[PDB]
Amino acid sequence: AQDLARAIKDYPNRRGDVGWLDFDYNLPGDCLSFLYYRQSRENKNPSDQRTSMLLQALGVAESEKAKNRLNTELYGD
Amino acid sequence: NPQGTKPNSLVCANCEGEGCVACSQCKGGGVNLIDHFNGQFKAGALCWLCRGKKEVLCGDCNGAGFIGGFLST
Amino acid sequence: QGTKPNSLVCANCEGEGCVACSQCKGGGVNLIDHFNGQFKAGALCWLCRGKKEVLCGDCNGAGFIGGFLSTFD
Amino acid sequence: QGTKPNSLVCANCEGEGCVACSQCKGGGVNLIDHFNGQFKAGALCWLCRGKKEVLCGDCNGAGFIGGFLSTFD
Amino acid sequence: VKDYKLTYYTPDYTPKDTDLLAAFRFSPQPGVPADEAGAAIAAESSTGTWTTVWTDLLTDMDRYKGKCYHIEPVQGEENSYFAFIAYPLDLFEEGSVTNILTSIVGNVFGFKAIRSLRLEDIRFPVALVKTFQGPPHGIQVERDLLNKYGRPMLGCTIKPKLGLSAKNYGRAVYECLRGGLDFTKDDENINSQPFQRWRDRFLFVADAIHKSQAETGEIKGHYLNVTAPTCEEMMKRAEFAKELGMPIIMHDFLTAGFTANTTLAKWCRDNGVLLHIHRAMHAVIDRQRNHGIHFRVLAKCLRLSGGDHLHSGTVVGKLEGDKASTLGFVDLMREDHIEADRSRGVFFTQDWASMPGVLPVASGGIHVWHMPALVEIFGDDSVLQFGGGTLGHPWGNAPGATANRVALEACVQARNEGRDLYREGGDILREAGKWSPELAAALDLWKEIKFEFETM
Amino acid sequence: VKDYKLTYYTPDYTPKDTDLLAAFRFSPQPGVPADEAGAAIAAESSTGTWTTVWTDLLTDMDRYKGKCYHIEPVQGEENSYFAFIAYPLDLFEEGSVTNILTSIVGNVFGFKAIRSLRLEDIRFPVALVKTFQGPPHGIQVERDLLNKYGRPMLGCTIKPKLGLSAKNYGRAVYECLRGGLDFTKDDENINSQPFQRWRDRFLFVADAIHKSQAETGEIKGHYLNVTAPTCEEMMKRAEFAKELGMPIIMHDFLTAGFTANTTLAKWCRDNGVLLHIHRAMHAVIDRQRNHGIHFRVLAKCLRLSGGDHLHSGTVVGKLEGDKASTLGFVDLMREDHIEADRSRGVFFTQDWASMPGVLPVASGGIHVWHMPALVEIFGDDSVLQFGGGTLGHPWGNAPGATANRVALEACVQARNEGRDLYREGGDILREAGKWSPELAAALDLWKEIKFEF
Amino acid sequence: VKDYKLTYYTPDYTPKDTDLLAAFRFSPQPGVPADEAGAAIAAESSTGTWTTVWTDLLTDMDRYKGKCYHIEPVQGEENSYFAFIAYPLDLFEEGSVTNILTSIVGNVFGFKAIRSLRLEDIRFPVALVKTFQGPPHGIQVERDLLNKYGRPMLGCTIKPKLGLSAKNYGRAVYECLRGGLDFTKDDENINSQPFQRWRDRFLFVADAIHKSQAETGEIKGHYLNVTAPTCEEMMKRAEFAKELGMPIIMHDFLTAGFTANTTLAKWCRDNGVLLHIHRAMHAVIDRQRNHGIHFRVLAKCLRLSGGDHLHSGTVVGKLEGDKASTLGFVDLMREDHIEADRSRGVFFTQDWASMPGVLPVASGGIHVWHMPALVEIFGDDSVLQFGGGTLGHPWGNAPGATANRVALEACVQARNEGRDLYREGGDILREAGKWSPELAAALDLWKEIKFEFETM
């Protein structure tokens, strides 16, 4: 709950980023998914440490643009 | 040494591992069926034993969920 | 080693611990002049210097076979 | 010193740190008998005693030009 | 030595009153007699020879030698014997338990011709008892310091909870002590660990003790655990605990050793605190019935080294094959003269020379329906620890303490008037649980036990 | 939430690099399964509950509990299994090994639903290895302190210790050390008995050391037993042994405890003394296979708390498996990184983070005919203690010393040439004994040629 | 070394979890590549050679060697790069910050071929974190000792006065503490100087603390400055301050050093006082953006060495280019696991192994109209120092404290119910400043700020 609230409050001040407007604001799962996705992107190709965080992000998102974007990322260009 | 279902390391049968169990004297509203002279819970809304929480610890395992060596705590 | 039915007792010395010197055979004098010449025949036995006994090698004088203390090996 | 585009790498040894001995030219034997006579021709090189290398003077063996640690000067 | 009777197995020998006797139960390898094995156990615990090739030059012989004076077979078991052997008094240092241990059980337990070896008892002469200090205070002084007469004392460990903040720890201790208990015990795994360092725990526990004792009117305590990595750290914890004004501390005498326990007992004797000993890591030594060191030996060594309370384990759930042994070594550490009786495990007659006694602590998953039994079995001089039977009351910490207090006083007051506690335990508790809701709730949560047909 | 799950047997859980792993071999009562017994061992040695009715007071647990994660069975034996358990790092405090012992092997051994339980190995993370002091000196530092390179060291134990006055004790020590030995050892159960007090013995032993040192030209030593009844007396004995100028002392870490051993190790580091650890009273704990604590666990705990030498017992006459086991943990006392090889008892991969080593000591009445074997099994990083193999020579103590010395250096030289020590051991010993009378007397006395297949 | 890739710049190398990583931002001289400058920074921080002419005789090398495993360019700036290099664990002493500093930044900052060098971050492994002690108490214990839950704490330095007697000092401290503040801080230039020696100051401050705390009912404090010329003088001041019963002391960790700060932190841990660290003389090291040591490195080194409060500076008046960095570093010293994120300046993922946190102190010319912002930027785990916003109230010292207290409680009470603190700061304060003349007067002179369009 603490990390969820912190991610929700951190979301607004990332106005410019990679794929920011594909995660909506009025859903908590998508805020948390954006946190995980941005934390994973701060890495290089898999190394089994980026894929873990992408799979964590996919297990909590609840929109559809979030889902097809994270699928574009984790599985196939 | 209660064992739930088939023999195991005595997961206590009285609760089947729940540790907590439903309290005996509250039905639905955590109400007290019992009426007693003290009257604190006699009137109705609050169950005397669990004070409305609707569960207690299991008496056989004391909430541990298993017996064997650790009947204790 | 050991005598068998009573395993502990040494079989080479039968518990004596000391044994007759195997070089001079208990005589206390050298049978032959040594090649080095330090020890000469009919003077003193080279190994025991006349005492006519040594410690038994198997038990190192303990009379014990397999004791944790003494000849544990 | 240094090679220029890559300034740090030593220019005299090209990073080797050690270099062929300049006295015996890597032969390990003295070219000439010394005036003192302690060192003689065809025996051992006076400077390196046969090892056929020394440390490069410019970098004192570091392969570094201008390093604060080693050859700071 | 040879067919000559080994000079170590001397059955015609009767021991002096200044000899340390020891009784081993051994089982030998196939093809080895019993007498030879007895004499070999006698020779391993001392000079490791049967002959005189080393140990005789002028007179150095027959003075530092452990004769073996009795061997008999165990009834029931086959290929299993008792060997009684007897050591002189000049082999042992004056005032050291480490030396006695490392001289008896030093390297005999690794003898190859023996299949298994157990040390069942031991007898210290009075001449050796009087060189040790003993418990700091004892039973009578320990009862007079706290001013608790008649009844046994109550305590409540806080074991299930883990990771507690120091302040919530102090809070739970306060709620227990205020409700009507006497002591309270730290979990024995709790030392200074990153979630709860020691000085904060000591501070908040001391504050709780002062508050509850001031607003109740009697003397309360809390066993603070001073087990440490070094002699310096341990003495530092103990000094700080005395500064705050604490009556009692705690220690672990098997993982920390006997040197540290002796040091701490001398400090406690100088500075006037009581010492509670916690037997941890003991089943590693005395669980299997065919190898190790039975626990009554360690109880004696602790009465010698130092300690006022000792964990001895309950007997409510055992048969008379082990209830007997536990009652035996509970008498071995309270009285002053114990006569030899093999049914209760006591092998030798031991006289303690007016050294004080220790106090047995009965613990581990007990609740109110056991209080009738424990009261008579262990007697007035016992401490009763309630792990879960207190903290789990349906509505709090203080009510659970009140319930246990009421039950205890009911049982003891009833025993004073001649009523039986085997026939009339349940009805005593039920008659008491009528003018108090706490005891009623407690009786309803747990379940009656019905010891046996009508007694025991 | 129901316990059919057991929430403690997590077979897919992989353990972190900051978890302390433990491997038990247990055998359960008739009628109890294996995985339940593994979960029960994990719960007994932690918060003793499977449920969450206490710990979940305010959403805070599942980080102070161990969890079983592998319950393979044992080959050959039936009704006995292995159980691996992983404990978090924030359960133990730093620098304290009593806390580790109390937290793992506390009450678990008293569990009722198992017949027998033994603790076979343990793995300390580097995060936890780095907070202990370790050996005071190590191996390199002590070879440099004593100035002895390229061969084992030689020691003798004094067997007619009882009823021997302090001065005759000193004279025997002088005779042995003068012949060519390096160390003499004080018997384990000689502290302060009325026939021979300790100050009166430290005096004469120091005198003998000083005399022989100069004449031999070698740095000599005698392990002086400082095991005392209290912390105070122990410290007094150690301070006096330092004032005299002694280079090494002795202790018993299983009767005196771990608190006293850690205190002594810190003192010895601060004051430049070496420490030799004697392992009395060990078979009480680790002889029988069914129950106890295997000795390699105690060797690891010792390397952590402190100690420079450690008794380990000969390996010449063990059969196999039981022999390859011993060699196993010798490598857990000298090597810094040890890979998992279950054939040699090592269960987990252990990395020691550049903490010094410990020196094995082989003891047990060995004689000269054993010199080849030992010299090639333990290598050159060890001490060899001789009992009757030195004091029983027909000529005296100094001849026995020179005999053992000659045999050892002969074996070492041939090994340098590459002659196989085991194959040519009888031959190597025979040729050396030709120009030396002492070695010839010894060869004959100890008739045990000890055939080598 | 040569065209051979230098044996120090190994881009295919991935570091182990027991390596200390460091990230430098460097700018090289004209005519020097980037890879060679990276490898040279790697060779200067360790053995100062590229070759093996010294450091290879038998084995002793290629271990104590700082490989450089990454180099990249900085975005925006030209001729400016980031170099990530990685040191082994065997180079560093166990428990010493001095050694880590003098091994990393020892003599690399004087390299000639580099035009400028900055140390931006650092990553300690867990194996090294666990050999230091850390803060004496932390956040939770420090909150439990004082019994202040929910809100952030208030304090008021007495800065502009200098040359006051000791008694008037005690008087002002009393007026401030009685009115409703919690702490009060000494000016950091105040040591024993001829107009005001230290023992007199300590005496009168202690008397004021006792009076106000007795007649108010909660726990008050005052950061006494124990910075001294020597280890002896400093320990003497600290012992006397403990004797009077003071909860908290103060120190300067950059002019006094790290040896004195470690010593004082161990004393505070033994004796149970809290330590407040004051960062003075820091802009000498970390102001210019192209040379020095960024401050987050020193914040980490202080969390390791010891300290409970730390000055971090406000963010009310910065842009998101530096507000981000300050928030990033603030999280680096409160939490327990921080993920790599370059927008907030965190370069590496740092895990703190359940070591406690420190507490950020926000100070320097702030007044009531800032209270809405601070309360929701720092959260409620922080301390707020009011230099002039308290002592300058139109009619005294105690009314100013009352005004600040009222404003703080209004803002926090409002925050919990869900009301925004960016849209509704001003009207919250105005609605609160209606039943209290003090807050009305304070709102009068101090002006509203109007952060931005409507938020941030």
PDB file of N, CA and C in Angstrom, chain B residues 1-2 5-7 10 12-13 18-20 24 26-27 36-38 41-42 45 48-49 55 57 60 68 73:
ATOM      1  N   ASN B   1      -3.395 -35.888  20.349  1.00  0.00           N
ATOM      2  CA  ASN B   1      -2.650 -35.474  19.165  1.00  0.00           C
ATOM      3  C   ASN B   1      -3.525 -35.488  17.914  1.00  0.00           C
ATOM      4  N   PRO B   2      -4.388 -34.472  17.756  1.00  0.00           N
ATOM      5  CA  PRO B   2      -5.286 -34.535  16.598  1.00  0.00           C
ATOM      6  C   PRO B   2      -4.579 -34.353  15.259  1.00  0.00           C
ATOM      7  N   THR B   5      -7.668 -35.203   8.777  1.00  0.00           N
ATOM      8  CA  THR B   5      -7.797 -36.190   7.694  1.00  0.00           C
ATOM      9  C   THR B   5      -6.827 -37.359   7.870  1.00  0.00           C
ATOM     10  N   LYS B   6      -6.012 -37.622   6.857  1.00  0.00           N
ATOM     11  CA  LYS B   6      -5.039 -38.710   6.918  1.00  0.00           C
ATOM     12  C   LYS B   6      -3.906 -38.390   7.894  1.00  0.00           C
ATOM     13  N   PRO B   7      -3.120 -39.426   8.351  1.00  0.00           N
ATOM     14  CA  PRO B   7      -2.018 -39.000   9.235  1.00  0.00           C
ATOM     15  C   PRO B   7      -1.034 -38.030   8.604  1.00  0.00           C
ATOM     16  N   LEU B  10       0.452 -34.164  12.575  1.00  0.00           N
ATOM     17  CA  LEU B  10      -0.602 -33.627  13.423  1.00  0.00           C
ATOM     18  C   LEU B  10      -0.984 -32.179  13.160  1.00  0.00           C
ATOM     19  N   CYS B  12      -3.345 -29.807  13.475  1.00  0.00           N
ATOM     20  CA  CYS B  12      -4.413 -30.050  14.424  1.00  0.00           C
ATOM     21  C   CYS B  12      -5.757 -30.197  13.743  1.00  0.00           C
ATOM     22  N   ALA B  13      -6.455 -31.289  14.041  1.00  0.00           N
ATOM     23  CA  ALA B  13      -7.759 -31.549  13.432  1.00  0.00           C
ATOM     24  C   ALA B  13      -8.829 -30.564  13.847  1.00  0.00           C
ATOM     25  N   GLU B  18      -6.157 -23.915  10.607  1.00  0.00           N
ATOM     26  CA  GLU B  18      -6.619 -22.502  10.639  1.00  0.00           C
ATOM     27  C   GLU B  18      -5.979 -21.751  11.786  1.00  0.00           C
ATOM     28  N   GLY B  19      -5.706 -22.399  12.916  1.00  0.00           N
ATOM     29  CA  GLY B  19      -5.163 -21.713  14.063  1.00  0.00           C
ATOM     30  C   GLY B  19      -6.265 -20.970  14.828  1.00  0.00           C
ATOM     31  N   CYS B  20      -6.896 -19.984  14.176  1.00  0.00           N
ATOM     32  CA  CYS B  20      -8.144 -19.372  14.689  1.00  0.00           C
ATOM     33  C   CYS B  20      -9.292 -20.304  14.307  1.00  0.00           C
ATOM     34  N   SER B  24     -17.636 -20.264  19.459  1.00  0.00           N
ATOM     35  CA  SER B  24     -18.865 -21.039  19.660  1.00  0.00           C
ATOM     36  C   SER B  24     -20.164 -20.284  19.909  1.00  0.00           C
ATOM     37  N   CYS B  26     -21.371 -17.149  19.036  1.00  0.00           N
ATOM     38  CA  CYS B  26     -21.873 -16.026  18.243  1.00  0.00           C
ATOM     39  C   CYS B  26     -22.436 -16.485  16.919  1.00  0.00           C
ATOM     40  N   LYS B  27     -23.671 -16.097  16.625  1.00  0.00           N
ATOM     41  CA  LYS B  27     -24.243 -16.444  15.335  1.00  0.00           C
ATOM     42  C   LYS B  27     -24.599 -15.205  14.539  1.00  0.00           C
ATOM     43  N   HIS B  36     -26.303 -13.444  31.114  1.00  0.00           N
ATOM     44  CA  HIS B  36     -25.606 -13.702  32.371  1.00  0.00           C
ATOM     45  C   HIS B  36     -25.805 -12.613  33.408  1.00  0.00           C
ATOM     46  N   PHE B  37     -25.561 -12.937  34.671  1.00  0.00           N
ATOM     47  CA  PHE B  37     -25.801 -11.978  35.753  1.00  0.00           C
ATOM     48  C   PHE B  37     -24.987 -10.685  35.662  1.00  0.00           C
ATOM     49  N   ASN B  38     -23.743 -10.769  35.197  1.00  0.00           N
ATOM     50  CA  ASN B  38     -22.905  -9.582  35.089  1.00  0.00           C
ATOM     51  C   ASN B  38     -23.565  -8.598  34.147  1.00  0.00           C
ATOM     52  N   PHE B  41     -22.418  -8.445  28.481  1.00  0.00           N
ATOM     53  CA  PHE B  41     -22.738  -8.917  27.141  1.00  0.00           C
ATOM     54  C   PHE B  41     -24.084  -9.612  27.122  1.00  0.00           C
ATOM     55  N   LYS B  42     -24.763  -9.637  28.260  1.00  0.00           N
ATOM     56  CA  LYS B  42     -26.048 -10.324  28.365  1.00  0.00           C
ATOM     57  C   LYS B  42     -27.109  -9.719  27.471  1.00  0.00           C
ATOM     58  N   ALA B  45     -26.027  -7.393  21.632  1.00  0.00           N
ATOM     59  CA  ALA B  45     -25.124  -7.143  20.501  1.00  0.00           C
ATOM     60  C   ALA B  45     -23.716  -7.722  20.567  1.00  0.00           C
ATOM     61  N   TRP B  48     -20.177 -12.595  24.398  1.00  0.00           N
ATOM     62  CA  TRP B  48     -19.368 -12.536  25.589  1.00  0.00           C
ATOM     63  C   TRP B  48     -17.927 -12.976  25.364  1.00  0.00           C
ATOM     64  N   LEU B  49     -17.708 -14.133  24.750  1.00  0.00           N
ATOM     65  CA  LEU B  49     -16.343 -14.642  24.578  1.00  0.00           C
ATOM     66  C   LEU B  49     -15.485 -13.818  23.628  1.00  0.00           C
ATOM     67  N   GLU B  55     -14.324 -14.921  16.088  1.00  0.00           N
ATOM     68  CA  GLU B  55     -13.347 -16.008  16.201  1.00  0.00           C
ATOM     69  C   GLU B  55     -12.534 -15.914  17.498  1.00  0.00           C
ATOM     70  N   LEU B  57      -8.869 -18.332  19.223  1.00  0.00           N
ATOM     71  CA  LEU B  57      -7.841 -19.335  18.972  1.00  0.00           C
ATOM     72  C   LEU B  57      -8.315 -20.732  19.268  1.00  0.00           C
ATOM     73  N   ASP B  60      -7.097 -26.699  20.967  1.00  0.00           N
ATOM     74  CA  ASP B  60      -6.226 -27.856  20.900  1.00  0.00           C
ATOM     75  C   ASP B  60      -4.790 -27.512  20.592  1.00  0.00           C
ATOM     76  N   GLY B  68       2.390 -32.011  17.586  1.00  0.00           N
ATOM     77  CA  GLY B  68       3.735 -32.536  17.754  1.00  0.00           C
ATOM     78  C   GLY B  68       4.391 -31.896  18.958  1.00  0.00           C
ATOM     79  N   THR B  73       2.113 -22.599  22.550  1.00  0.00           N
ATOM     80  CA  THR B  73       1.953 -21.395  21.733  1.00  0.00           C
ATOM     81  C   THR B  73       1.572 -21.706  20.295  1.00  0.00           C
TER      82      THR B  73
END
